[PDB]
Amino acid sequence: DAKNIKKGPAPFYPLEDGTAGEQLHKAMKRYALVPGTIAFTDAHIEVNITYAEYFEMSVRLAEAMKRYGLNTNHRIVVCSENSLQFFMPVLGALFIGVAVAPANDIYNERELLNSMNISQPTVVFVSKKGLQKILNVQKKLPIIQKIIIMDSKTDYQGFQSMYTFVTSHLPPGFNEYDFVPESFDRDKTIALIMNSSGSTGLPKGVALPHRTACVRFSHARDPIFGNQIIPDTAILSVVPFHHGFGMFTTLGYLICGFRVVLMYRFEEELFLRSLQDYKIQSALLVPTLFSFFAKSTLIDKYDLSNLHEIASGGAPLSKEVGEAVAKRFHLPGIRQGYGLTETTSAILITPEGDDKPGAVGKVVPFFEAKVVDLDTGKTLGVNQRGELCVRGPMIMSGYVNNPEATNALIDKDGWLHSGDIAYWDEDEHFFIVDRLKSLIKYKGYQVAPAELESILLQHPNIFDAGVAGLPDDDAGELPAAVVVLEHGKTMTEKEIVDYVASQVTTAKKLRGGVVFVDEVPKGLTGKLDARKIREILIKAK
């Protein structure tokens, strides 16, 4: 008891049998048979593509890859900005159990190399604007046998398109509607290899088995935790396909037969006009697009009467920004949640209606969550703050070729340890403790760490900084920082302290001093890791 474990309710829609490829194949085939059902719409070029087109090409890419030689022992990379084509090789691979590692058109060569060094792909699908970078990475990773151009019909600079590639390898009388996807073990066959960003150091490869997608397809249909399947539902999605939010909303939308309208370059008017003209029900935004829309004054120009929901997925939002965005859009609130790459998608989610101010949401079906004491690891009770831990069928199988990082994160009982601080209240709402609102407190007077961090990031020789409060006794807290120097530059602690003092009131002085590090510790979300910053400076002095 262990009435202190917060458990998700029963799913509205049971977990269905099959691989992710099989459930996607089955749903999309039914939508393919209704002419004119729109799967994806490109807001920039205004072209629609139907489920019939989308199913037939994905089916053909699956068989073409199968005949080329790929099976559950291979991985592909899809390297492209959001596009009408992005999900064709993705769906094709899932149909035959080939693992997919997404990457973006505009990631630098260094980022692509490390990502694809982890995923080690036999075949790369790339858009025209990513070709040169994939070529340059290929000469450094010779497991890359074949490059296929996504946004072309003819061959392109000697390389095959998806359309000519399919034609080289399909059997003579191939029938898209007789194809059957590979059956295989959903628990161990890897569906996605997602990149991590995440904590400190190099991005890791998060391996996600087909099961996580299949569980997510239950969430997508849920009237409480996902989207109610009404006909002519359209989503305006402005989030990258190659992070969890965009990858797994989209796969779920395809299961549901929805129209997915895409924007890959954000523009204010195009966004608002697309909400209006496409009669969008739900919009997906990256967190800093929420702050953008808190400032927009054009929203009242548009007829947004069909708009029911703006969502941020796994990213928590401050109460201030969310309320402001809800108010600008005349919504009762916004849909928030908390998830990690390592959880596939959001595992805490705002329940429909059941929103509470400042809450991030509630535990999703199939999941349980707890908070634990940061010293004993013992499960805490109501309204007590500890580390958030979660357990469920959407947790990754692990990091690709790094069981050390895996076992350090997931315990012997399957609890993932988030590194983030949370509590739950009496109604089972969760709250994520935001580092930015934890004020440092010096003889009465409080300072936001991000204020000082901003002062420090201003200096030409300071590359990165993390500010937290050093416990003192005399004092309460002394503001103190870990500082990452810019390559080449030399600074002393007294130099940095003198610089801050010359920019802040005397209460906000950096009396705790400075500890030079190589990197500011970050959590799995990418936000600064205050607890570890504090540890570093305690150990130092």
From Swiss-Prot:
<dbReference type="GO" id="GO:0051087">
    <property type="term" value="F:protein-folding chaperone binding"/>
</dbReference>
<dbReference type="GO" id="GO:0016405">
    <property type="term" value="F:CoA-ligase activity"/>
</dbReference>
<keyword id="KW-0455">Luminescence</keyword>
<dbReference type="GO" id="GO:0046872">
    <property type="term" value="F:metal ion binding"/>
</dbReference>
<dbReference type="GO" id="GO:0047077">
    <property type="term" value="F:Photinus-luciferin 4-monooxygenase (ATP-hydrolyzing) activity"/>
</dbReference>
<dbReference type="GO" id="GO:0005524">
    <property type="term" value="F:ATP binding"/>
</dbReference>
<comment type="function">
    <text>Produces green light with a wavelength of 562 nm.</text>
</comment>
<keyword id="KW-0503">Monooxygenase</keyword>
<keyword id="KW-0576">Peroxisome</keyword>
<keyword id="KW-0460">Magnesium</keyword>
<dbReference type="InterPro" id="IPR025110">
    <property type="entry name" value="AMP-bd_C"/>
</dbReference>
<protein>
    <recommendedName>
        <fullName>Luciferin 4-monooxygenase</fullName>
        <ecNumber>1.13.12.7</ecNumber>
    </recommendedName>
</protein>
<keyword id="KW-0560">Oxidoreductase</keyword>
<keyword id="KW-0067">ATP-binding</keyword>
<comment type="similarity">
    <text>Belongs to the ATP-dependent AMP-binding enzyme family.</text>
</comment>
<dbReference type="Pfam" id="PF00501">
    <property type="entry name" value="AMP-binding"/>
</dbReference>
<dbReference type="GO" id="GO:0005777">
    <property type="term" value="C:peroxisome"/>
</dbReference>
<keyword id="KW-0479">Metal-binding</keyword>
<dbReference type="GO" id="GO:0008218">
    <property type="term" value="P:bioluminescence"/>
</dbReference>
<keyword id="KW-0599">Photoprotein</keyword>
<dbReference type="Pfam" id="PF13193">
    <property type="entry name" value="AMP-binding_C"/>
</dbReference>
<dbReference type="InterPro" id="IPR000873">
    <property type="entry name" value="AMP-dep_synth/lig_dom"/>
</dbReference>
<keyword id="KW-0547">Nucleotide-binding</keyword>
<dbReference type="InterPro" id="IPR020845">
    <property type="entry name" value="AMP-binding_CS"/>
</dbReference>
<dbReference type="InterPro" id="IPR045851">
    <property type="entry name" value="AMP-bd_C_sf"/>
</dbReference>
